[PDB]
Structures are given as structure tokens and as C-alpha cells.
Design a protein around this ligand. Structure first.
Ligand SMILES: O=C(O)c1ccc(CCCNS(=O)(=O)c2ccsc2C(=O)O)cc1
Length: 358
């Protein structure tokens, strides 16, 4: 814990906790590709369990980075292509709005206005089919970006189909396990319950509720230690010994689409570094992050650019997190908190810390 890391992290996170009234938080800074951890406050207020380096947090949409990388890995394995029609892997989707909608579109929220959430009315596999069959695009495919669980959710489920494994099984065996993320979970097991923080929403203890495509779109829980390892694995995919995985991490950080200052990868979003912090800070606020935006195609996709700020925010009703790293600088940060507080606040903190270490 170099005193300068200590200094920036404390001067930055202390007023962040106080002003946002965050009950518990873990922060990892990756500096020169080595992790340094910081924990505050409570995993469980009622039971006075402190946040530790073992506490599980719900990642929310940061789960989409795992999804984009398990997708990338299926690509590298030869099992899927992003140029393939959604219908190759779901022939029952016969409604003709599906014509022209490829897995790149599902992955990058460019299919033509798939909604943000799957309706809670959808619980069975037949219900989900019905949902996608009935859906009417607002736009032609690859013209507009609209952030959507129902979009990258479906990417995740179709992408694992030719493996013959369930999504969770594919995730575990091709991603969590080779990267040694042994306390990262889609479903948290009884033995691990004791590490599972409560989320806090209006002062009530909550956990994520089950939902269609939850695992694929918002369903990973993880510790600050594995999340640091996750950052390290995406900072330096070339130290990854597993070829399809190292290659899927590259593919998740290719640039497929640009809107304004940002580039859409698989799960990840990227901006050229040096970035203007106003750009990433303001861009992180939801009604601009969740807004319908026109995209320009990157034809062909730019391979992972090292001088990028690569990041993803994610929330559940009781959790807020953020991951950001700069490959060229070997620098990254993870921020896990068991309160959902505004995204700008998160990115603002992350940028002040990484800027000063930059
Ligand atoms: O605490 C609970 O009971 C609960 C919380 C969130 C959910 C849904 C997760 C919301 N996160 S998301 O991926 O769907 C999303 C959507 C718009 S922004 C965003 C995010 O994670 O930042 C379900 C149950």
C-alpha cells in the first residue's frame, strides 16, 4: 500500500462514502498491474459484519463484461460468428423483423430498439420466445444504440448454445475457472452465503430478484479480490494461457460502433485515453447512458486499443459498482458498494484516483 495510493484513495473515497451515505464499500486499485485493497463500513448492518476482501457484492451490469468475454471466447472457439443471424441459433424466431439482426447487433444493443428490461411477465422459455416474436423494432438494425438487457441478454444465451452447456456452466468452466475467480458466482452457494453482503435501498436490506436472462445481463456476484483479478486479466490478456479466452478478451475490447466519444465493445465500453473526464463522467449518467443514440459502424472493428479508458458501471436495486482500466498504463480500479448511488459520482471518484496515479 504505497502511501501515494493510500493518499488518493482515502482523500477520494472518504467524502464519497459520507456524501452518498454508502454503508459498505471495497475498492481495488491496480497499479503497475499489482492490486491494493481498501474496505469500509458494513456488508450487513443488522448483523455488524464488516466489508472484507471476501465479501460478495452484486455486480449488476458489470456482469455484461463477463458475458461479452464468454461470447468472445465462443467466437475464438469457432462456435459462433458475430456476422451470423440471430436465427441460426434460434430457428423458432421466425417473425420477419428478425431478418437482418445478427449476433453483433444483440451483443452491442444495435438490433433496433430491444427494450431495457425483459418484461417481468416473462418467466418461461415459451414466454420469452413469444416476447421476441412479438417485439416491433423502432429502427433498422445497426442504426441506433439503446442499452438493453433484453439485447445482450439474448446474445449470452444464444452464444453458449453450440457448446451444449448452460450459460452458468459455460461461464464457470471457460471463464471463472481458468482465471481462478473461485468466489465469483451467478448463483451464490449455501457455503458462501455468510460472505454475501446485503444491498441497501431506502435503508432496507435487499438482494437481486430472479428474472429472465438475469445471469447473462446482471447476475454475477464477486469479491474485490476476484474483481481485481478480472481487471488484471482484461489489462493483460496475453498472460492468459488459454488461447480462446485470451482471444475473447481481445474481441470484447474491439471497437464495433462509435457514438459521441464512446466505442461499444462486447460488454465493455472504451474511450481514447487521454479522455476528457467530463466526457466519461457526464456520459455515465443514466439518462444519457440509457438514451437512444445513432451509431456509426466501425468497418472493420478496431482491435483492442491500448491507450483507452475501458469501463462499465452496473447496479442492482441495492448495489452500485464500477470497473475502469487503462491497458497502456497497467492501471485500473474496482469500486463495489452495497448501495446504488449515481454513476457520475462513481466515475468522478475513479478518474480522480487513476488520474493522480496516471
Ligand atoms: O435488489 C433487488 O431486489 C433487484 C435489483 C435489481 C434488479 C435488476 C438489476 C438492474 N441492473 S441492470 O443491468 O438491469 C441496469 C439497467 C439499466 S442501468 C443498469 C445497471 O446495472 O447499471 C432486480 C432485483
Amino acid at each position: 500500500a504505497p502511501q501515494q495510493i493510500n493518499d488518493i484513495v482515502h482523500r477520494t473515497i472518504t467524502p464519497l462514502i459520507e456524501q452518498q451515505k454508502i454503508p459498505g464499500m471495497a475498492v481495488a486499485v491496480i497499479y503497475q498491474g499489482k492490486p491494493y485493497y481498501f474496505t469500509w463500513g458494513y456488508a450487513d448492518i443488522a448483523k455488524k459484519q464488516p466489508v472484507t476482501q471476501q465479501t460478495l457484492f452484486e455486480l449488476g451490469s458489470v456482469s455484461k463484461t463477463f458475458t461479452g468475454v464468454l461470447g468472445g471466447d465462443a467466437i475464438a472457439r469457432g462456435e459462433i460468428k458475430l456476422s451470423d443471424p440471430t436465427t441460426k441459433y434460434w430457428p423458432e424466431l421466425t417473425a420477419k423483423q428478425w431478418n437482418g439482426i445478427t449476433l453483433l447487433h444483440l451483443a452491442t444493443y444495435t438490433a433496433g430498439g430491444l427494450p431495457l428490461q425483459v418484461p417481468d411477465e416473462v418467466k418461461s422459455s415459451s414466454d420469452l420466445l413469444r416476447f421476441y416474436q412479438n417485439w416491433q423494432p423502432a429502427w433498422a438494425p445497426g442504426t441506433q444504440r439503446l442499452y438493453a438487457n433484453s439485447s445482450i441478454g439474448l446474445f449470452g444465451a444464444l452464444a453458449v448454445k453450440p457448446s451444449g452447456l448452460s450459460f452458468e456452466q459455460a461461464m464457470q468452466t471457460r471463464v471463472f475457472q481458468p482465471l481462478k475467480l473461485n468466489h465469483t458466482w451467478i448463483n451464490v452457494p449455501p457455503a458462501e452465503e455468510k460472505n454475501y453482503a446485503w444491498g441497501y435501498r431506502e435503508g432496507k436490506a435487499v438482494h437481486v430478484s430472479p428474472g429472465a436472462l438475469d445471469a447473462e445481463a446482471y447476475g454475477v456476484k464477486s469479491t474485490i479480490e476476484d474483481m481485481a483479478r478480472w481487471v488484471q486479466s482484461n489489462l493483460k490478456p496475453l498472460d492468459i494461457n488459454e488461447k480462446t479466452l485470451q482471444q475473447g478478451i481481445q474481441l470484447a475490447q474491439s471497437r464495433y460502433w462509435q457514438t459521441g466519444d464512446m466505442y461499444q465493445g462486447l460488454g465493455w465500453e472504451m474511450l481514447d485515453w487521454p479522455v476528457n473526464p467530463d466526457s466519461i463522467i457526464n456520459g455515465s449518467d443514466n439518462k444519457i447512458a440509457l438514451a437512444a443514440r445513432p451509431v456509426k459502424a466501425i468497418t472493420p472493428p478496431t482491435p483492442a486499443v491500448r491507450a483507452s479508458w475501458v469501463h462499465k458501471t452496473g447496479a442492482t436495486g441495492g448495489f452500485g459498482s464500477y470497473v475502469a482500466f487503462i491497458p497502456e498504463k497497467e492501471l485500473g480500479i474496482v469500486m463495489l458498494a452495497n448501495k446504488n448511488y449515481p454513476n457520475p459520482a462513481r466515475v468522478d471518484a475513479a478518474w480522480q484516483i487513476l488520474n493522480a496515479l496516471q
